[PDB]
Amino acid sequence: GKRLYAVAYDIPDDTRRVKLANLLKSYGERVQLSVFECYLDERLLEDLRRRARRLLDLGQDALRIYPVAGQVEVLGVGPLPE
Structure with missing residues (x-):
């Protein structure tokens, strides 16, 4: 079922990074400059x-x-x- 995931990214390009952060907002919340916390199950992870x-x-x-x-x-x- 749903579990907590830490999603960490290293994207040199600013435009790609902005797009990726905007995507991650649909699954969770920012915790640091390069990390989101997302609650996902198998379907949402895929x-x-x-x-x-x-x-x-x-x-x-x-x-x-x-x-x-x-x-x-x-x-x-x-x-x-938590």
């Missing part, structure tokens, strides 16, 4: 990948998707964890 693939230059860009299980820990500024 949808996210499918749409992210349209946008990325896969020779230059990186996107990592981490399924999270356990307590997220936050030091410093930024959104408090």
Whole structure:
């Protein structure tokens, strides 16, 4: 079912990065400059990948998707964890 994912990206191109961030908003919320937290199940995860693939230059860009299980820990500024 739905689980928390950390979605971290490294996109050198500003235009592609803006498009990717706008896409990620449809699945979750920003937590840091290069990271969103998204609640996804299998179907939404596939949808996210499918749409992210349209946008990325896969020779230059990186996107990592981490399924999270356990307590997220936050030091410093930024959104408090569950």
